Structure formats: structure tokens, C-alpha cells
Design a binder for this molecule. Structure first.
Ligand code: IN7
Ligand code: CA
Ligand code: CA
Ligand code: CA
Ligand code: ZN
Ligand code: ZN
Length: 167
């Protein structure tokens, strides 16, 4: 595993998130479902808990956007960068943005929202890229033949517990 430079981490175990807006591609229940499953993956292996805000500033602001969208890294149209997220801290730190020029899916065929969200939340928590080709935090996107076979690798677990400890 790898962490970010200077090891940013949250110094608190109760985090909040807000889904500020929604993709055209999926019903809202499918996107809520994807992000809460993505939160849950990390919750199980740490002492962190997440709760949702419907207004105000949450720690992790989640949104869908195209091209230039209010930070230093505009999205780039279809393909290439699918999403990005910032390391722990105030303001834009912690946040995750998804490129809505992708076509988001629930299935194993397109660009799957759950797999990407789980990866991005790894960033939001302080993890950078892994060299393990098994790891969630591997730098190159791919999906699975069967989503029910999804699991965190030992590397992702070792990485995240280095920051926050076990549950
Ligand atoms: O976030 C960045 O770094 C930059 N954005 S990006 O759009 O290039 C990017 C987005 C996602 C991934 N993923 C890595 C592998 C993965 C996975 C892992 C195990 C089993 C199934 C699927 C699913 C997400 C990698 C890069
Ligand atoms: Ca934030
Ligand atoms: Ca893109
Ligand atoms: Ca889209
Ligand atoms: Zn952004
Ligand atoms: Zn990444």
C-alpha cells in the first residue's frame, strides 16, 4: 500500500458525507446504494463511521460534474479519468467528484459506479495507490466478471488500518 505524502488522515472517527447532486444515468436509489456500499466496505475494517447530511458542509462532499467544475483538475470528456478525490482535510479535501461524461452503471459491463466510488473513498480516507494488482487501490480501472466476488485485498486492509486501526 501507499499513503499520501505527509500522511494526511482524519483525526476523528465520525465522518459525514453529502451527495450534492445526481447523475442522469441511474435512478437515485441506485446511486445512494452504490455509495453506501462503498462507505460500508471501509467501515467494516476500521473504527470509522459515516452519516449522511442532506444540507450544509459535510466532510466528504460527493458530486457529479463535467469538464471545468471548480478545482484545479477539470474532467476530460468520455473515457480516461473517470473520477477523482482529495486526501483528508478541510474544504475540498475529502471530496469526491465523478465525471458525468462517463456512462455510469450498476452492472459488470460499463463503468461501474460502486467500484469507482469505493476506490475514491479510499483516497478520501488517506490511501494512495497500490502496486498489488488485486487491490482496490490499484491505479488502473477494471471491473469484475461477478460483482458478488468483490472484496478488499489484504493490502487495502493493511493500509487503512495503518491509519485508523482495526475495528
Ligand atoms: O482515482 C484515480 O486514481 C484517478 N481516476 S481513474 O478514473 O483513473 C481510476 C478510477 C478507478 C480505478 N479503480 C481501480 C481498480 C478497481 C477495482 C479493484 C478491484 C476489483 C475491481 C475493481 C476499480 C477502481 C482506478 C483509476
Ligand atoms: Ca471536504
Ligand atoms: Ca473522463
Ligand atoms: Ca453521465
Ligand atoms: Zn474535481
Ligand atoms: Zn486512485
Amino acid at each position: 500500500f501507499r499513503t499520501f505524502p505527509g500522511i494526511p488522515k482524519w483525526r476523528k472517527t465520525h465522518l459525514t458525507y453529502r451527495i450534492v447532486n445526481y447523475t442522469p444515468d441511474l435512478p437515485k436509489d441506485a446511486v445512494d446504494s452504490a455509495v453506501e456500499k462503498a462507505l460500508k466496505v471501509w467501515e467494516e475494517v476500521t473504527p470509522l463511521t459515516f452519516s449522511r447530511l442532506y444540507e450544509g458542509e459535510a466532510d466528504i462532499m460527493i458530486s457529479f460534474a463535467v469538464r471545468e467544475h471548480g478545482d484545479f483538475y477539470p474532467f476530460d470528456g468520455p473515457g480516461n479519468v473517470l473520477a477523482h478525490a482529495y486526501a483528508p482535510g478541510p474544504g475540498i479535501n475529502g471530496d469526491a467528484h465523478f465525471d458525468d461524461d462517463e456512462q455510469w452503471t450498476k452492472d459488470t459491463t460499463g463503468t461501474n459506479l460502486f467500484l469507482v466510488a469505493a476506490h475514491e473513498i479510499g483516497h478520501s480516507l488517506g490511501l494512495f495507490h497500490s502496486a498489488n494488482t488485486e487491490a482496490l487501490m490499484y491505479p488502473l480501472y477494471h471491473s469484475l466478471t461477478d460483482l458478488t466476488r468483490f472484496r478488499l485485498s489484504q493490502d487495502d486492509i493493511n493500509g487503512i488500518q495503518s491509519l485508523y486501526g482495526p475495528p
